[PDB]
From a paper:
Stabilization of Torpedo californica acetylcholinesterase by the divalent cations Ca+2, Mg+2, and Mn+2 was investigated. All three substantially protect the enzyme from thermal inactivation. Differential scanning calorimetry showed a single irreversible thermal transition. All three cations raise both the temperature of the transition and the activation energy, with the transition becoming more cooperative.
The crystal structures of the Ca+2 and Mg+2 complexes with Torpedo acetylcholinesterase were solved. A principal binding site was identified. In both cases, it consists of four aspartates (a 4D motif), within which the divalent ion is embedded, together with several water molecules. It makes direct contact with two of the aspartates, and indirect contact, via waters, with the other two. The ASSAM server retrieved 200 other proteins that display the 4D motif, in many of which it is occupied by a divalent cation. It is a very versatile motif, since, even though tightly conserved in terms of RMSD values, it can contain from one to as many as three divalent metal ions, together with a variable number of waters.
Author numbering:
A (entry chain A), B (entry chain A): 4 to 535
């Protein structure tokens, strides 16, 4: 009966799947909400009406409606992030991996996919939870949530499109895991939520939101934090973008009711096809429909919550990758190429700075340019290329995360910080892109343990180390072996601010990750933009 | 009150001692038996009458009366094993190291010193328990027991000198630890007895003896096992040696009562001065007064007990050193020298074989000689030297221990076997002696953690690893980290017989330690001697 489980919403039957010369149980595509279709588009989720009979949970569910990246057709490096199942608004499902035999009450980890709040799928190869549940004896859950306009169209003060419903989808999955994970051998008192990019911002947002805090124990944030410049908009800006979406689709804009009626009448792809038109600027690393600072899911501004300690106080483990900007420059900035080392001219450097800091005035652009230009060597195309990578990564990922870690650490119960800088031996992207946004995920999830993926022995070892750090942290609140001779990952403290490199070489400890540039992005540039 | 403890026999006050930039509590010289003096010489121990007032336990006790090695005066390599306190028949005391602060109920380890059952001291520098109690948070006990004639004069059928009383001293200390270690923060349900050479044989003897089995949980045996050829004698041989001792001292030998009266009248040094005269042969690695196979402490023959599973079934960890014979050849075989590489001539090789296997007839000596001679190179003095080292070590330590491990493993609950082959960088003995009998003890007890002892960084790491293996085994029954990425020490199984090297290089696993030579010593030579 291992594969048959009775839950408070009905029965579900899973399937035995092989992994690494053994087997585990998978429960794929379990519904946790009413399908958010028809007149429920844009609305808060409603929990799934209990069902009669047995739910077949042996195959992955549909993916949510989303923009699909077709920039590099036939290229695995990009297509592996696209939906790999049929897309449907009927998409609020979760997946569970349970070791065999089924443990009594063990650690649970819930993965929240990223993708800028406009894309993402629980079903991607690189999110296959079987290697982690197996190797670490944890119950591994992956949830799903509406993205794009379907998840984040915000007409504040409307009850039909209030904003943040994709975050409420995530919370409802977390609620379901709370009420039902015991029946799978999971301990609901020991749930770790973890996610990368917009998934990592999401995790931070559940740390902040009062209504989410009780639904988990600890948290892991990978290349994302809640205060990221791309991860939220104001109530006014969210409303402006919702109106602009209707303007692009020739909607009645006279009232929220008439606008929403129109938008609910459009086919999903009609919304997706105009999604990027609502952005205020020509930009990179900016996404149209994202969480809104509404005074409900977020009681006050993120900064005031972080300053006053208005968040869940627990343990956190988080970090960034070395070359966070390269993916976004490749797709959106002039001069970059998948087929060449992408030496960037002075003129293209200037254009890239403006795309990268689209909200800045000309003085702010001059400040960024001065901060990142080597005036002893200003026409070095390699330095210009690497400088844009640092601008994009520092502004959008690394310095927001450092701001979050420094503010969080003042009230929290323990912080572990990493810098992932291993370039995979089998990477399909060119060398200049380095250690790319999202490319630690395959190590967290154990893909280098699979012989046919052609990683090296050192990379298999790194992946096992990482999975073990992650799962030991989920279980105890400390990535470290309780009494081992291997080098310890030191706590990050307000005073010494230590972090470790994650790579194949012997562990090195450092302090004050990119502190110089983060003073620029976190203190000086905001002040300059606010003054001028 | 950390240093004041109430025990069932009285109050004891200890002392705070520094260790490795911290501090711990030491309770030194606690009595566990009536002083075995006067008419109690040779008698079974009687437990210590409870005392009024507080016992001062801030300094080491006397050492037992024993032969003192003066072969190399002024040389630390030998003198560090000599008694370092005044010698006295009043010597049955134990020492306790307790971490600070005092734990509630933690793992206990009781050290049993070696020294061939004729020498040994709980107070030696290399037995300083403070580094182990501190570094591993265990309550570390060292006991003491009568040696030489005082502990092992055996007139079977006498009640005044019944034999084995040194083993009964050890048991009474184990009984005291059982009844009283809780008051020190020790868990009496989790006591590991460990010892080297005669201490390791002793440990095996408590595994075998019904009256000892309940007084501990697990056991560690270092370069010694109960079936070692030097570690016991027959009831008849023990009686012959007791009579011969009295013959050397012009005693009435007409009856046990008259013999024992005489021997109890002699000063301790009068007994020590003739101790070696009672041996039947010119020999090395043979000691005069040792445990006796009496039908009481040992219900039947050791071999029959090992075959029938008549022993405590638990977990054991044990092993040997690479060059067990060198110490004994240096002291007792012709051609060996502390001042030279000791190339051994054919004639001296033949003399050494006879000293090493003193019980063998000429055919048995020929068999040993053939087994260990390279007849393609018979006058190679280096090969002859190393061959004697192997003969002495294989016959007296390694092959008896392998016999014990193979018989024990058939009934026990888990076996971990090691081969220690690291030569200390600061060893005071010459190079030819290699990895000497007893020279793993300083690593087990943590001396390489002390900067002024001038070990290398690699040796400090090895010592920490070893202490951790040992203490993790005491606590769990498995030397291994429960879920670590460092290489595992595999169980020794009847079928694959795996063991590890203990040294500074990456862990290597092997099988069937010296199996070829041990078939010779454990099966063939006994058969040949029994036939001829
Ligand atoms: C459970 O589902 C297994 C795989 O099913 C596939 O997905 C379902 C939703 C259908 O669309 C089916 O046509 C697909 O092949 C089946 O192999 C299995 O038989 C199913 N079990 C039961 C009891 O229906
Ligand atoms: C406890 O003992 C400490 C060390 O003592 C030495 O050993 C004792 C047995 C005597 O022989 C003494 O002369 C030695 O110096 C003392 O320093 C300490 O004061 C003693 N404490 C008490 C309360 O007597
Ligand atoms: C976490 O909280 C516990 C309980 O108050 C406390 O003992 C511990 O020191 C805290 N650790 C950190 C790193 O804040
Ligand atoms: C791994 O390498 C082998 C060739 O040794 C190849 O057949 C296989 O397709 C490779 N796997 C990939 C590229 O994913
Ligand atoms: C030790 O004993 C336990 C309890 O019977 C058993 O489960 C375990 O497998 C045994 N281990 C060995 C190595 O014999
Ligand atoms: C260790 O070496 C130093 C010299 O660097 C010496 O003073 C000290 O006595 C040595 N310790 C010993 C030999 O135990
Ligand atoms: Mg309509
Ligand atoms: Mg870079
Ligand atoms: Mg692990
Ligand atoms: Mg350990
Ligand atoms: Mg008299
Ligand atoms: Mg040798
Ligand atoms: Mg340790
Ligand atoms: Mg671990
Ligand atoms: Zn209409
Ligand atoms: Zn007399």
């Amino acid at each position: 009966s291992e594969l048959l489980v009775n839950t408070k919403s009905g029965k579900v039957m899973g399937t035995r799947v092989p992994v690494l010369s053994s087997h585990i149980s998978a429960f794929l595509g379990i519904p946790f909400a009413e399908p958010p279709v028809g007149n429920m588009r844009f609305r808060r989720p409603e929990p799934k009406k209990p069902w009669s009979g047995v739910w077949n949970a042996s195959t992955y569910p549909n993916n949510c409606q989303q923009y699909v990246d077709e920039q590099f057709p036939g290229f695995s490096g990009s297509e592996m992030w696209n939906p790999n199942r049929e897309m449907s608004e009927d998409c609020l499902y979760l997946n569970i991996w349970v070791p065999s035999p089924r443990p009594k009450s063990t650690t649970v980890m819930v993965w929240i996919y990223g993708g800028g709040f406009y894309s993402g799928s629980s079903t991607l190869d690189v999110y296959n939870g079987k290697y982690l549940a197996y190797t670490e004896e944890v119950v591994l859950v992956s949830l799903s949530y509406r993205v794009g306009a379907f998840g984040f169209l915000a007409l504040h003060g409307s009850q039909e499109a209030p904003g943040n419903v994709g975050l409420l989808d995530q919370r409802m999955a977390l609620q379901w895991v709370h009420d039902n994970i015991q029946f799978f051998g999971g301990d609901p008192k020991t749930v770790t939520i973890f996610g990368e990019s917009a998934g990592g911002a999401s995790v931070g947002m559940h740390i902040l939101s009062p209504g989410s805090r009780d639904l988990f124990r600890r948290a892991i944030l990978q290349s994302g934090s809640p205060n990221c410049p791309w991860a939220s908009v104001s109530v006014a800006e969210g409303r402006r973008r919702a109106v602009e979406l209707g303007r692009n689709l020739n909607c009645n804009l006279n009232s929220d009711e008439e606008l929403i009626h129109c938008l609910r009448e459009k086919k999903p792809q009609e919304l997706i096809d105009v999604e990027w038109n609502v952005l205020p600027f020509d930009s990179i690393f900016r996404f149209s429909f994202v969480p809104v600072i509404d005074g409900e899911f977020f009681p006050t501004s993120l900064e005031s919550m972080l300053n006053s300690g208005n968040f869940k106080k627990t343990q956190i483990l988080l970090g960034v990758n070395k070359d966070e900007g390269s993916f976004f420059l490749l797709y959106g900035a002039p001069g970059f190429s998948k087929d060449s080392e992408s030496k960037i001219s002075r003129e293209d450097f200037m254009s890239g700075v403006k795309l990268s800091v689209p909200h800045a005035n000309d003085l702010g652009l001059d400040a960024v340019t001065l901060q990142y230009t080597d005036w002893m060597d200003d026409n070095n195309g390699i330095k210009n290329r690497d400088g844009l990578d640092d601008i994009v990564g520092d502004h959008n990922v690394i310095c927001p995360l450092m701001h979050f870690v420094n503010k969080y650490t003042k009230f929290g119960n323990g912080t572990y910080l990493y810098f992932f800088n291993h370039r995979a031996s089998n990477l399909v992207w060119p060398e200049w892109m380095g250690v790319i946004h999202g490319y630690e995920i395959e190590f967290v999830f154990g893909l280098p343990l699979v012989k046919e993926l052609n990683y090296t022995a050192e990379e298999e070892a790194l992946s096992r180390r990482i999975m073990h750090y992650w799962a030991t942290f989920a279980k105890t609140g400390n990535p470290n072996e309780p009494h081992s001779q291997e080098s310890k990952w030191p706590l990050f403290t307000t005073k010494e601010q230590k972090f470790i490199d994650l790579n194949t070489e012997p562990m090195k400890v450092h302090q004050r990750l990119r502190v110089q540039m983060c003073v620029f992005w976190n203190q000086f540039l905001p002040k300059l933009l606010n003054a001028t």
